[PDB]
Write a protein that binds this ligand. Structure first.
Ligand SMILES: *[C@@H]1O[C@H](CO)[C@@H](O[C@@H]2O[C@H](CO)[C@@H](O[C@@H]3O[C@H](CO)[C@@H](O)[C@H](O)[C@@H]3O)[C@H](O)[C@H]2NC(C)=O)[C@H](O)[C@H]1NC(C)=O
Ligand SMILES: *[C@@H]1O[C@H](CO)[C@@H](O[C@@H]2O[C@H](CO)[C@@H](O)[C@H](O)[C@H]2NC(C)=O)[C@H](O)[C@H]1NC(C)=O
Ligand SMILES: *[C@@H]1O[C@H](CO)[C@@H](O)[C@H](O)[C@H]1NC(C)=O
Ligand SMILES: *[C@@H]1O[C@H](CO)[C@@H](O)[C@H](O)[C@H]1NC(C)=O
Ligand SMILES: OC[C@H]1O[C@@H](O)[C@H](O)[C@@H](O)[C@H]1O
Ligand SMILES: [Ca+2]
Length: 641
């Protein structure tokens, strides 16, 4: 009915920021090859202050060469004795974010690790000092090569922690003069981390934040007892339609209200991965067409604004926050300098369903809300007003100032369903705008890449999304016909997070493609036992990469060939002998039209009119039989969608 907002009785918990994740996995893959100015606009919509999402926090995967949801991300140590601080795009992303917001808070977390850390096991805790050394090299590198200070380091995404590891990781950070860097654990459930902290003072000393995943707005008693900052360190993961923006809006408030969480971080920052990959379009905005420049500033960018443009890490929540009588919720915060921000949400059950968890139905309906400013707040007479309505929508529209000059220090609102209001003393608010970008367009139906780039800006060719193994630009001075190629660089299975395939593979193009011709030069580096393939109609990737079907055309250095229906090689379409050895350049062609396929070795037919499942559709792809060195060159694809 009436709700009091006051601070004379003290303050709530310190606010830590709203953020998002790049990674887990390859979520930003297709953002790096956006033409300008679009790439830069997209970044502005995410990171520029007083503009778009205006994020406070950027969390990135520390790549371990394993598949980690929508692809793999390259590690800084592929092998023992390898150190390279320039692979992939997270370094870049971090720099672009610091460019726009110098005060952005940066976080790193591993999902997978290179297999060599396991010392013969797929386990990152066999040698604690080795795994810590690995993780600490990354933090050092960020600083030494990119001038990036990493503020928070995690443990092992949604996997078990080892308390001795966390202790070692702290000792190791300190030893390298990284006392400044804080530790967040365990990026999984509230337990066993929370009880672990109450039972072990030494573990308690070295963990600074409890970050939990998909908590459904709630915490647990042990976490409250710990006195640690509590964060939803990964949340959201829902299609950025109105439903998703509704989900985001509700949990932004109710994570603090119900769960005492002082930060929430969305997976993922931006949908820059093929939509047909797992959890497609579940970023705060969409940017999945570098070939066209098309991007969508989706509802969740403006939901974010309603909190980020009007708060900063270091502000405090008030004690007075809660639910509304008739549905929805409200939080309020101050900076302790006379500024006050009020964020109100009325998301209806039906337009705010998150993927994890699903909420039993709850009611929201029209209501009036009366707010009264007691304590050091009574002295406020003017408040700027921002308003969003989800579902025909209006986004982040500024409304006329509200005045409380009567001396009541009180006002009232006509709240309805699926609305958000931000009431703030701050006047910096802005609904940033660039002109609309180009219209969406399918992936090009003729496409070529000869990999001829001597100093590439990124470590991998555009549009190729690795789903097992890691493919890289490769310069080979000692050959002149193939001096610039794409090379698969893993020589052993990673300490996996997902169920990586047994074969490496990178997918590309348009998932709708159904008739297509794929050509590529391939070179097998391993004698006797090596193998490579090219494919089309590849229908699954990411988390599901093991399930992928399609038409796979393999050659091996034992003088043989197989055509399979599946990446796992279980199902045979044709197989035979071929004049193929290791360490020789061969040109593969694969043609698939309706019910039939054919392969050519070096322009000459190897197999014709082999029957294949149809209809079927999916990407094109290149890859290798195991985790083995191989090269590709002069890639082309001609497709019909
Ligand atoms: C990919 O290739 C398949 C196979 O070529 C395409 O399906 C085929 O579509 C054609 C024409 O669109 C069908 O042609 C036939 O033409 C005669 C004469 O006018 C007509 O009387 C028949 O009823 C039929 O329309 C053909 O039957 C059909 N083949 C199969 C196996 O379904 C497909 O359109 C191609 N996909 C894309 C989008 O490029
Ligand atoms: C409200 O917010 C601002 C920013 O936090 C407070 O600080 C001043 O704000 C102006 C405008 O941004 C700056 O140009 C000054 O340099 C800031 N002064 C200081 C000492 O930081 C401001 O004091 C707060 N008070 C209100 C309600 O306006
Ligand atoms: C957390 O929130 C509850 C209500 O949701 C509140 O009563 C309690 O004081 C808070 N716990 C803290 C800040 O430790
Ligand atoms: C929700 O509550 C309102 C107000 O009490 C009521 O009019 C409406 O019938 C309720 N809807 C459901 C499905 O419970
Ligand atoms: O909902 C999808 C997300 O789920 C999390 O468990 C994971 O950390 C993310 O990488 C992503 O897969
Ligand atoms: Ca070349």
């Amino acid at each position: 009915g009436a709700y009091v907002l006051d601070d004379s009785d003290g303050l709530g918990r310190e606010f830590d920021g709203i953020g998002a994740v790049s990674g887990g996995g390859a979520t930003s893959r297709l953002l790096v090859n956006y033409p300008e100015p679009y790439r830069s606009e997209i970044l502005d919509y995410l990171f520029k202050p007083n503009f778009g999402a205006s994020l406070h926090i950027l969390k990135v995967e520390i790549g371990g060469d394993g598949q980690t949801t929508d692809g793999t991300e390259p590690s800084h140590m592929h092998y023992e004795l390898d150190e390279n601080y320039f692979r992939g795009y997270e370094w870049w992303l971090m720099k672009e974010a610091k460019k726009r917001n110098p005060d952005i808070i940066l976080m790193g977390l591993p999902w997978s690790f290179p297999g060599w850390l396991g010392k013969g096991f797929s386990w990152p805790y066999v040698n604690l000092q080795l795994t810590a050394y690995y993780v600490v090299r990354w933090i050092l590198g960020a600083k030494h090569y990119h001038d990036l200070d990493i503020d928070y380091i995690g443990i092992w995404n949604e996997r078990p922690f080892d308390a001795n590891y966390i202790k070692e990781l702290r000792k190791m950070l300190d030893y390298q003069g990284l006392q400044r860097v804080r530790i967040i654990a365990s990026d999984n459930l509230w337990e066993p981390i929370s009880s672990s902290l109450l039972l072990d003072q030494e573990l308690w000393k070295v963990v600074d934040v409890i970050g939990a995943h998909y908590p459904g707005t709630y915490t647990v008693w042990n976490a409250k007892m710990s006195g640690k900052k509590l964060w939803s360190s990964e949340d959201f993961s829902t299609i950025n339609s109105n439903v998703g923006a509704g989900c985001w809006s509700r949990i932004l408030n109710q994570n603090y209200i119900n769960g005492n969480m002082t930060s929430t971080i969305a997976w993922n920052l931006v949908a820059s991965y093929y939509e047909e990959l797992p959890y497609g379009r579940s970023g705060l905005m969409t940017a999945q067409e570098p070939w066209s420049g098309h991007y969508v500033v989706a509802s969740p960018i403006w939901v974010s604004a309603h909190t980020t443009q009007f708060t900063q890490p270091g502000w405090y929540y008030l004690k007075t926050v809660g639910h509304l009588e008739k549905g929805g919720s409200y939080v309020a915060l101050t900076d302790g300098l006379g500024n006050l921000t009020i964020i109100i949400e009325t998301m209806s059950h039906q337009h705010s369903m998150c993927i994890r968890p699903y909420l039993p139905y709850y009611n929201v309906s029209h209501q009036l809300a009366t707010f009264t400013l007691k304590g050091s707040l009574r002295e406020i007479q003017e408040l700027q007003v921002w308003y969003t309505k989800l579902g025909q929508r209006l986004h982040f529209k500024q409304l006329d100032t509200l005045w409380l000059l009567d001396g009541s220090g009180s006002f009232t609102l006509e709240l309805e369903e699926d609305e958000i209001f931000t009431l703030t003393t701050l006047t910096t608010g802005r609904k940033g705008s660039y002109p609309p970008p180009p219209s969406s367009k399918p992936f090009p139906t003729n496409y070529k890449d000869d990999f001829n780039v001597e100093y590439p800006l990124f470590s991998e060719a555009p549009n190729f999304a690795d789903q097992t193994g890691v493919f890289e630009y490769y310069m080979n001075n000692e050959d002149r016909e193939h001096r610039f190629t794409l090379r698969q660089v893993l020589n052993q299975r990673p300490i996996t997070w997902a169920a990586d395939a047994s074969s490496t593979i990178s997918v590309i193009g348009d998932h709708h493609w159904t008739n297509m011709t794929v050509q590529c030069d391939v070179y097998i580096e391993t004698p006797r036992s090596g193998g490579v393939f090219i494919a089309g109609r590849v229908n699954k990737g990411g988390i599901l990469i093991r399930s992928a079907t399609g038409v796979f055309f393999w050659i091996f250095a034992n003088g043989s060939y197989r055509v399979t229906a599946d990446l796992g090689g279980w199902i045979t379409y044709a197989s035979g002998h071929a004049d193929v050895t290791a360490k020789r350049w061969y040109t593969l062609t694969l043609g698939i039209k309706g019910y039939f396929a054919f392969g050519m070795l070096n322009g000459t037919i190897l197999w014709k009119n082999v029957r294949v499942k149809y209809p079927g559709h999916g990407w094109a792809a290149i890859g290798t039989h195991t985790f083995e060195f191989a090269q590709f060159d002069n890639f082309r694809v001609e497709a019909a969608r």
